[PDB]
PDB file of C-alpha atoms in Angstrom:
ATOM      1  CA  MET I   1       8.577 -23.869 -12.177  1.00 33.02           C
ATOM      2  CA  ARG I   2       5.074 -22.950 -12.711  1.00 31.78           C
ATOM      3  CA  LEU I   3       3.588 -25.408 -15.343  1.00 30.69           C
ATOM      4  CA  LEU I   4       4.080 -28.983 -15.816  1.00 29.30           C
ATOM      5  CA  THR I   5       2.577 -30.461 -19.177  1.00 31.47           C
ATOM      6  CA  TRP I   6       2.222 -34.171 -19.678  1.00 33.05           C
ATOM      7  CA  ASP I   7       1.586 -36.842 -22.253  1.00 32.76           C
ATOM      8  CA  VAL I   8      -0.188 -39.764 -20.934  1.00 35.53           C
ATOM      9  CA  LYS I   9       1.748 -42.887 -22.366  1.00 38.02           C
ATOM     10  CA  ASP I  10       3.883 -44.888 -19.884  1.00 33.92           C
ATOM     11  CA  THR I  11       3.601 -41.896 -17.625  1.00 37.53           C
ATOM     12  CA  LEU I  12      -0.182 -42.039 -16.553  1.00 37.59           C
ATOM     13  CA  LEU I  13      -1.761 -44.726 -18.507  1.00 37.64           C
ATOM     14  CA  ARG I  14      -1.197 -47.813 -20.614  1.00 37.91           C
ATOM     15  CA  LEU I  15      -3.480 -50.238 -22.441  1.00 37.28           C
ATOM     16  CA  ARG I  16      -4.636 -53.005 -20.446  1.00 35.53           C
ATOM     17  CA  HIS I  17      -4.445 -55.588 -23.030  1.00 36.00           C
ATOM     18  CA  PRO I  18      -2.308 -55.973 -26.211  1.00 39.19           C
ATOM     19  CA  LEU I  19      -4.129 -54.739 -29.319  1.00 39.66           C
ATOM     20  CA  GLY I  20      -4.114 -58.120 -30.958  1.00 36.90           C
ATOM     21  CA  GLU I  21      -5.572 -59.822 -28.042  1.00 34.40           C
ATOM     22  CA  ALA I  22      -8.193 -56.973 -27.656  1.00 34.26           C
ATOM     23  CA  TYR I  23      -9.237 -57.092 -31.482  1.00 34.63           C
ATOM     24  CA  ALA I  24      -9.270 -60.842 -31.330  1.00 36.05           C
ATOM     25  CA  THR I  25     -11.310 -61.154 -28.361  1.00 35.31           C
ATOM     26  CA  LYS I  26     -13.887 -58.545 -29.670  1.00 34.64           C
ATOM     27  CA  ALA I  27     -13.927 -60.351 -33.097  1.00 36.70           C
ATOM     28  CA  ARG I  28     -14.456 -63.853 -31.540  1.00 37.52           C
ATOM     29  CA  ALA I  29     -17.448 -62.283 -29.603  1.00 38.40           C
ATOM     30  CA  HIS I  30     -18.990 -61.046 -32.909  1.00 41.54           C
ATOM     31  CA  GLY I  31     -18.380 -64.508 -34.649  1.00 40.23           C
ATOM     32  CA  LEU I  32     -15.055 -63.960 -36.410  1.00 42.46           C
ATOM     33  CA  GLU I  33     -12.097 -66.066 -35.402  1.00 38.90           C
ATOM     34  CA  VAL I  34      -8.853 -64.253 -36.205  1.00 36.46           C
ATOM     35  CA  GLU I  35      -5.487 -64.942 -34.625  1.00 35.71           C
ATOM     36  CA  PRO I  36      -4.095 -61.914 -32.474  1.00 36.68           C
ATOM     37  CA  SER I  37      -0.773 -62.192 -34.240  1.00 33.28           C
ATOM     38  CA  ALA I  38      -2.453 -61.544 -37.736  1.00 31.42           C
ATOM     39  CA  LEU I  39      -4.235 -58.645 -36.274  1.00 29.33           C
ATOM     40  CA  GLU I  40      -1.220 -57.178 -34.808  1.00 28.75           C
ATOM     41  CA  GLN I  41       0.677 -57.483 -38.203  1.00 29.93           C
ATOM     42  CA  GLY I  42      -2.401 -56.190 -39.848  1.00 28.87           C
ATOM     43  CA  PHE I  43      -2.737 -53.167 -37.685  1.00 27.00           C
ATOM     44  CA  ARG I  44       1.058 -52.263 -37.848  1.00 26.72           C
ATOM     45  CA  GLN I  45       0.662 -52.179 -41.557  1.00 28.96           C
ATOM     46  CA  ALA I  46      -2.656 -50.442 -41.618  1.00 28.41           C
ATOM     47  CA  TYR I  47      -1.762 -47.751 -39.134  1.00 31.73           C
ATOM     48  CA  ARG I  48       1.487 -47.089 -41.054  1.00 32.48           C
ATOM     49  CA  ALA I  49      -0.349 -46.870 -44.437  1.00 32.01           C
ATOM     50  CA  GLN I  50      -3.072 -44.660 -43.155  1.00 30.38           C
ATOM     51  CA  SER I  51      -0.591 -42.263 -41.536  1.00 28.17           C
ATOM     52  CA  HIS I  52       1.583 -42.187 -44.842  1.00 27.09           C
ATOM     53  CA  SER I  53      -1.333 -40.625 -46.766  1.00 26.60           C
ATOM     54  CA  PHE I  54      -3.420 -39.144 -43.944  1.00 26.79           C
ATOM     55  CA  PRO I  55      -1.061 -37.708 -41.335  1.00 22.32           C
ATOM     56  CA  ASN I  56      -2.501 -36.519 -37.887  1.00 22.67           C
ATOM     57  CA  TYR I  57      -5.780 -38.375 -38.280  1.00 23.47           C
ATOM     58  CA  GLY I  58      -6.467 -37.072 -41.783  1.00 27.89           C
ATOM     59  CA  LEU I  59      -7.751 -33.737 -40.313  1.00 24.84           C
ATOM     60  CA  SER I  60      -5.885 -31.768 -42.985  1.00 25.18           C
ATOM     61  CA  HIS I  61      -7.141 -33.852 -45.690  1.00 24.99           C
ATOM     62  CA  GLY I  62     -10.910 -34.246 -45.568  1.00 23.17           C
ATOM     63  CA  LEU I  63     -11.071 -36.863 -42.733  1.00 20.72           C
ATOM     64  CA  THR I  64     -12.383 -36.991 -39.123  1.00 20.09           C
ATOM     65  CA  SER I  65     -10.221 -38.919 -36.655  1.00 21.08           C
ATOM     66  CA  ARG I  66     -13.380 -41.414 -36.078  1.00 22.24           C
ATOM     67  CA  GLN I  67     -13.295 -42.191 -39.882  1.00 22.23           C
ATOM     68  CA  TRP I  68      -9.446 -42.288 -39.806  1.00 21.38           C
ATOM     69  CA  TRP I  69      -9.654 -45.098 -37.106  1.00 24.22           C
ATOM     70  CA  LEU I  70     -12.565 -46.857 -38.772  1.00 19.58           C
ATOM     71  CA  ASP I  71     -10.493 -47.021 -42.114  1.00 21.41           C
ATOM     72  CA  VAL I  72      -7.368 -48.323 -39.928  1.00 22.84           C
ATOM     73  CA  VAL I  73      -9.518 -51.202 -38.224  1.00 21.85           C
ATOM     74  CA  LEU I  74     -11.280 -52.100 -41.491  1.00 22.74           C
ATOM     75  CA  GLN I  75      -7.871 -52.517 -43.032  1.00 25.71           C
ATOM     76  CA  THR I  76      -6.413 -54.421 -40.270  1.00 26.79           C
ATOM     77  CA  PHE I  77      -9.021 -57.046 -40.596  1.00 23.95           C
ATOM     78  CA  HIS I  78      -8.832 -57.051 -44.444  1.00 21.30           C
ATOM     79  CA  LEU I  79      -5.060 -57.576 -44.230  1.00 21.31           C
ATOM     80  CA  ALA I  80      -5.765 -60.542 -41.691  1.00 21.51           C
ATOM     81  CA  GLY I  81      -8.104 -62.212 -44.195  1.00 19.78           C
ATOM     82  CA  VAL I  82     -11.597 -60.654 -43.647  1.00 21.41           C
ATOM     83  CA  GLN I  83     -12.628 -58.424 -46.390  1.00 19.53           C
ATOM     84  CA  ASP I  84     -16.410 -58.164 -45.870  1.00 19.51           C
ATOM     85  CA  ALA I  85     -16.718 -54.557 -44.630  1.00 19.96           C
ATOM     86  CA  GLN I  86     -20.274 -55.405 -43.509  1.00 18.33           C
ATOM     87  CA  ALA I  87     -18.807 -57.901 -40.944  1.00 17.45           C
ATOM     88  CA  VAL I  88     -16.174 -55.816 -39.445  1.00 14.42           C
ATOM     89  CA  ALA I  89     -18.128 -52.364 -39.541  1.00 15.22           C
ATOM     90  CA  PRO I  90     -19.903 -53.187 -36.111  1.00 19.15           C
ATOM     91  CA  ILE I  91     -16.696 -54.603 -34.656  1.00 19.58           C
ATOM     92  CA  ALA I  92     -14.812 -51.538 -35.637  1.00 18.19           C
ATOM     93  CA  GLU I  93     -17.541 -49.387 -34.019  1.00 17.83           C
ATOM     94  CA  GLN I  94     -17.382 -51.205 -30.736  1.00 21.04           C
ATOM     95  CA  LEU I  95     -13.341 -50.972 -30.674  1.00 21.11           C
ATOM     96  CA  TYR I  96     -13.850 -47.293 -31.412  1.00 22.99           C
ATOM     97  CA  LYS I  97     -16.157 -46.680 -28.461  1.00 21.98           C
ATOM     98  CA  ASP I  98     -14.387 -49.074 -26.064  1.00 19.39           C
ATOM     99  CA  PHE I  99     -11.245 -47.160 -26.521  1.00 20.10           C
ATOM    100  CA  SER I 100     -12.706 -44.565 -24.278  1.00 23.74           C
ATOM    101  CA  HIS I 101     -13.899 -46.879 -21.508  1.00 23.58           C
ATOM    102  CA  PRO I 102     -11.936 -46.817 -18.412  1.00 29.24           C
ATOM    103  CA  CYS I 103     -11.702 -50.557 -18.388  1.00 33.69           C
ATOM    104  CA  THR I 104      -9.511 -50.328 -21.522  1.00 36.74           C
ATOM    105  CA  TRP I 105      -6.782 -48.620 -19.422  1.00 38.34           C
ATOM    106  CA  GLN I 106      -4.639 -49.117 -16.386  1.00 36.17           C
ATOM    107  CA  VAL I 107      -3.637 -45.947 -14.462  1.00 33.21           C
ATOM    108  CA  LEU I 108      -0.054 -46.557 -13.456  1.00 31.19           C
ATOM    109  CA  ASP I 109       0.908 -47.157  -9.734  1.00 30.91           C
ATOM    110  CA  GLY I 110       1.680 -43.776  -8.153  1.00 32.24           C
ATOM    111  CA  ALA I 111       0.623 -41.602 -11.181  1.00 34.21           C
ATOM    112  CA  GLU I 112      -2.353 -40.053  -9.565  1.00 36.58           C
ATOM    113  CA  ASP I 113      -0.467 -39.399  -6.262  1.00 36.16           C
ATOM    114  CA  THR I 114       2.271 -37.662  -8.286  1.00 34.17           C
ATOM    115  CA  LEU I 115      -0.261 -35.413  -9.963  1.00 35.30           C
ATOM    116  CA  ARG I 116      -1.766 -34.528  -6.589  1.00 37.79           C
ATOM    117  CA  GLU I 117       1.585 -33.782  -5.096  1.00 34.75           C
ATOM    118  CA  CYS I 118       2.477 -31.438  -8.095  1.00 37.38           C
ATOM    119  CA  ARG I 119      -0.710 -29.454  -7.463  1.00 37.19           C
ATOM    120  CA  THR I 120      -0.217 -29.330  -3.700  1.00 37.93           C
ATOM    121  CA  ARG I 121       3.228 -27.614  -4.713  1.00 35.32           C
ATOM    122  CA  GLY I 122       1.171 -25.036  -6.573  1.00 36.98           C
ATOM    123  CA  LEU I 123       2.022 -26.203 -10.090  1.00 39.00           C
ATOM    124  CA  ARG I 124      -0.400 -25.891 -12.916  1.00 37.31           C
ATOM    125  CA  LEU I 125      -0.740 -29.019 -14.827  1.00 40.41           C
ATOM    126  CA  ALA I 126      -1.833 -29.626 -18.656  1.00 42.34           C
ATOM    127  CA  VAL I 127      -1.907 -32.353 -21.233  1.00 41.52           C
ATOM    128  CA  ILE I 128       0.000 -32.139 -24.487  1.00 39.50           C
ATOM    129  CA  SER I 129      -0.524 -35.389 -26.382  1.00 39.23           C
ATOM    130  CA  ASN I 130      -0.546 -36.854 -29.934  1.00 36.09           C
ATOM    131  CA  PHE I 131      -3.765 -38.384 -29.396  1.00 34.63           C
ATOM    132  CA  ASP I 132      -7.062 -37.975 -31.189  1.00 33.62           C
ATOM    133  CA  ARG I 133     -10.061 -36.135 -29.614  1.00 34.33           C
ATOM    134  CA  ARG I 134     -11.153 -39.004 -27.336  1.00 36.68           C
ATOM    135  CA  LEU I 135      -8.294 -38.225 -24.843  1.00 35.97           C
ATOM    136  CA  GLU I 136     -10.589 -35.841 -22.887  1.00 34.27           C
ATOM    137  CA  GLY I 137     -13.105 -38.309 -22.379  1.00 31.88           C
ATOM    138  CA  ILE I 138     -10.653 -41.148 -21.549  1.00 33.19           C
ATOM    139  CA  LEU I 139      -9.193 -38.986 -18.697  1.00 34.04           C
ATOM    140  CA  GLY I 140     -12.648 -38.075 -17.559  1.00 35.28           C
ATOM    141  CA  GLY I 141     -13.860 -41.863 -17.458  1.00 39.60           C
ATOM    142  CA  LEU I 142     -10.703 -42.482 -15.155  1.00 39.08           C
ATOM    143  CA  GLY I 143     -11.256 -39.605 -12.793  1.00 37.63           C
ATOM    144  CA  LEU I 144      -7.981 -37.972 -14.039  1.00 36.21           C
ATOM    145  CA  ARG I 145      -9.421 -34.915 -15.952  1.00 35.36           C
ATOM    146  CA  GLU I 146      -9.747 -32.755 -12.772  1.00 37.31           C
ATOM    147  CA  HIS I 147      -6.030 -32.421 -12.340  1.00 39.31           C
ATOM    148  CA  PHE I 148      -5.555 -30.720 -15.765  1.00 38.90           C
ATOM    149  CA  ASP I 149      -6.187 -27.037 -16.780  1.00 39.36           C
ATOM    150  CA  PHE I 150      -6.617 -28.210 -20.433  1.00 40.28           C
ATOM    151  CA  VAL I 151      -6.067 -31.073 -22.683  1.00 41.31           C
ATOM    152  CA  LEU I 152      -4.256 -30.312 -25.887  1.00 40.99           C
ATOM    153  CA  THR I 153      -4.275 -33.095 -28.386  1.00 40.79           C
ATOM    154  CA  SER I 154      -2.647 -32.958 -31.855  1.00 45.89           C
ATOM    155  CA  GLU I 155      -6.187 -33.192 -33.076  1.00 41.76           C
ATOM    156  CA  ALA I 156      -7.126 -29.992 -31.329  1.00 43.12           C
ATOM    157  CA  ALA I 157      -3.861 -28.082 -32.111  1.00 39.48           C
ATOM    158  CA  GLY I 158      -3.676 -29.063 -35.703  1.00 33.31           C
ATOM    159  CA  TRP I 159       0.133 -30.196 -35.305  1.00 30.85           C
ATOM    160  CA  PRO I 160       1.614 -33.051 -33.474  1.00 25.69           C
ATOM    161  CA  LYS I 161       4.558 -33.151 -31.184  1.00 25.62           C
ATOM    162  CA  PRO I 162       7.428 -32.485 -31.799  1.00 21.77           C
ATOM    163  CA  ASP I 163       6.264 -29.549 -34.042  1.00 20.38           C
ATOM    164  CA  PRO I 164       6.949 -26.174 -32.139  1.00 22.96           C
ATOM    165  CA  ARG I 165       3.390 -25.017 -32.849  1.00 23.12           C
ATOM    166  CA  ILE I 166       1.795 -27.505 -30.422  1.00 22.32           C
ATOM    167  CA  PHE I 167       3.979 -26.417 -27.445  1.00 21.53           C
ATOM    168  CA  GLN I 168       3.435 -22.746 -28.431  1.00 21.68           C
ATOM    169  CA  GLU I 169      -0.262 -23.270 -28.204  1.00 21.51           C
ATOM    170  CA  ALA I 170      -0.102 -24.826 -24.772  1.00 24.15           C
ATOM    171  CA  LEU I 171       1.940 -21.907 -23.624  1.00 23.82           C
ATOM    172  CA  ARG I 172      -0.552 -19.407 -25.048  1.00 25.69           C
ATOM    173  CA  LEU I 173      -3.432 -21.309 -23.324  1.00 23.69           C
ATOM    174  CA  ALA I 174      -1.475 -21.371 -20.064  1.00 21.97           C
ATOM    175  CA  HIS I 175      -0.361 -17.678 -20.356  1.00 18.23           C
ATOM    176  CA  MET I 176       3.136 -18.994 -19.489  1.00 19.22           C
ATOM    177  CA  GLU I 177       6.699 -18.291 -20.641  1.00 20.12           C
ATOM    178  CA  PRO I 178       8.523 -21.335 -21.843  1.00 22.11           C
ATOM    179  CA  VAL I 179      11.453 -20.999 -18.960  1.00 22.22           C
ATOM    180  CA  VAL I 180       8.694 -21.531 -16.238  1.00 22.06           C
ATOM    181  CA  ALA I 181       7.208 -24.699 -17.946  1.00 21.33           C
ATOM    182  CA  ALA I 182       8.486 -28.327 -18.114  1.00 20.34           C
ATOM    183  CA  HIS I 183       7.020 -31.188 -20.117  1.00 16.45           C
ATOM    184  CA  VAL I 184       7.043 -34.846 -18.989  1.00 17.10           C
ATOM    185  CA  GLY I 185       6.522 -38.014 -21.554  1.00 16.48           C
ATOM    186  CA  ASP I 186       8.157 -41.108 -22.797  1.00 19.08           C
ATOM    187  CA  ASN I 187       9.382 -40.320 -26.414  1.00 17.89           C
ATOM    188  CA  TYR I 188      12.713 -38.809 -27.013  1.00 15.53           C
ATOM    189  CA  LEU I 189      11.731 -36.758 -30.036  1.00 15.35           C
ATOM    190  CA  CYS I 190       8.384 -35.800 -29.242  1.00 16.11           C
ATOM    191  CA  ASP I 191       8.668 -35.284 -25.384  1.00 18.49           C
ATOM    192  CA  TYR I 192      12.169 -34.454 -24.806  1.00 23.05           C
ATOM    193  CA  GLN I 193      13.574 -32.677 -27.912  1.00 24.24           C
ATOM    194  CA  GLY I 194      10.293 -31.024 -28.944  1.00 22.58           C
ATOM    195  CA  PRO I 195       9.636 -28.885 -25.802  1.00 22.41           C
ATOM    196  CA  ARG I 196      13.361 -28.017 -25.388  1.00 19.74           C
ATOM    197  CA  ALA I 197      13.301 -26.504 -28.988  1.00 19.25           C
ATOM    198  CA  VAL I 198      10.758 -23.863 -27.781  1.00 19.64           C
ATOM    199  CA  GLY I 199      12.548 -23.272 -24.467  1.00 16.69           C
ATOM    200  CA  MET I 200      10.786 -25.299 -22.149  1.00 13.11           C
ATOM    201  CA  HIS I 201      12.341 -27.738 -19.679  1.00 13.51           C
ATOM    202  CA  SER I 202      11.481 -31.564 -20.402  1.00 14.08           C
ATOM    203  CA  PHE I 203      11.973 -34.709 -18.571  1.00 12.58           C
ATOM    204  CA  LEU I 204      12.107 -38.197 -20.264  1.00 12.01           C
ATOM    205  CA  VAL I 205      10.514 -41.135 -18.519  1.00 14.04           C
ATOM    206  CA  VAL I 206      12.461 -44.232 -19.634  1.00 16.19           C
ATOM    207  CA  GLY I 207      11.221 -46.984 -17.694  1.00 15.79           C
ATOM    208  CA  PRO I 208      13.464 -49.710 -15.912  1.00 16.14           C
ATOM    209  CA  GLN I 209      14.663 -51.035 -19.439  1.00 18.24           C
ATOM    210  CA  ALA I 210      18.264 -50.301 -20.414  1.00 22.51           C
ATOM    211  CA  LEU I 211      18.543 -47.053 -22.237  1.00 20.10           C
ATOM    212  CA  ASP I 212      18.121 -46.404 -26.079  1.00 21.23           C
ATOM    213  CA  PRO I 213      21.780 -45.502 -27.070  1.00 22.29           C
ATOM    214  CA  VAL I 214      20.893 -42.032 -28.227  1.00 22.37           C
ATOM    215  CA  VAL I 215      19.260 -41.310 -24.894  1.00 19.53           C
ATOM    216  CA  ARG I 216      22.155 -42.720 -23.105  1.00 18.38           C
ATOM    217  CA  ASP I 217      24.594 -40.774 -25.208  1.00 16.95           C
ATOM    218  CA  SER I 218      22.696 -37.521 -25.529  1.00 17.75           C
ATOM    219  CA  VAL I 219      20.353 -36.870 -22.699  1.00 20.54           C
ATOM    220  CA  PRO I 220      21.651 -35.490 -19.517  1.00 17.49           C
ATOM    221  CA  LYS I 221      21.009 -38.061 -16.595  1.00 14.76           C
ATOM    222  CA  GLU I 222      19.491 -35.187 -14.699  1.00 12.89           C
ATOM    223  CA  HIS I 223      16.551 -35.210 -17.241  1.00 13.28           C
ATOM    224  CA  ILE I 224      15.976 -38.924 -17.324  1.00 18.23           C
ATOM    225  CA  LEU I 225      13.215 -40.296 -15.130  1.00 19.06           C
ATOM    226  CA  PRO I 226      13.227 -43.999 -14.617  1.00 19.42           C
ATOM    227  CA  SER I 227       9.759 -43.588 -13.151  1.00 21.65           C
ATOM    228  CA  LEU I 228       7.453 -40.783 -12.029  1.00 19.53           C
ATOM    229  CA  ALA I 229       8.644 -41.235  -8.681  1.00 20.57           C
ATOM    230  CA  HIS I 230      11.944 -39.388  -9.787  1.00 19.24           C
ATOM    231  CA  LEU I 231      10.064 -36.262 -11.247  1.00 20.79           C
ATOM    232  CA  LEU I 232       9.640 -34.256  -8.132  1.00 21.79           C
ATOM    233  CA  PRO I 233      13.158 -35.046  -7.106  1.00 21.96           C
ATOM    234  CA  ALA I 234      14.457 -34.027 -10.462  1.00 21.85           C
ATOM    235  CA  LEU I 235      12.553 -30.702 -10.404  1.00 22.88           C
ATOM    236  CA  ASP I 236      14.086 -30.087  -6.864  1.00 23.35           C
ATOM    237  CA  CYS I 237      17.683 -30.400  -8.342  1.00 26.80           C
ATOM    238  CA  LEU I 238      16.700 -28.055 -10.997  1.00 25.64           C
ATOM    239  CA  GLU I 239      15.300 -25.484  -8.452  1.00 26.31           C
ATOM    240  CA  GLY I 240      18.241 -25.998  -6.053  1.00 24.14           C
ATOM    241  CA  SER I 241      20.357 -24.402  -8.656  1.00 23.16           C
TER     242      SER I 241
END
């Protein structure tokens, strides 16, 4: 293997606080008292609605990803019962900015050691993520950007995983053939099936929870990582063949 590509969710990073709590905490500070559960439901609905009409951050239909997220936050609060856009606007701006701050995130235990160990083996690393343009700066603020040759977001690529074009663009940037590249992430469709459709290897991080039936029934156990601790061992069984 020569290249390992990564998504960041439940592999490298997770949000420190649930969204409802985060939105509610911010709102309280700014004089709006909204229940976290109301915001979590509002957000679910707002995010889905926005994606319905403006897929991949609206970039193909006249929006910027910052505007897309402002729209989602405004609508989250609206559904939660705060319709005054003047009142929410500043809250939305702080949430948008805070998203990039390292204190928003927890780097998973052992993730950075795993990246360092991959590099010491001579692997090139890169990111392939359905994330907006803020991902680069998130990684930089956490001291993780240094490990990666590039960070290819769906915003930058113009197509999200599992579309073959995002993987093909990563391979072009890496100057690598698919057979020497492996992708690692936590979503069956986006991170397991997607890369394999262009001939890359892929490994699915599933956590300690019992398996999704489709994964259980359809994915070889050799490709299933309960945690990142299992990645290098999985790669060695691949190489050993």
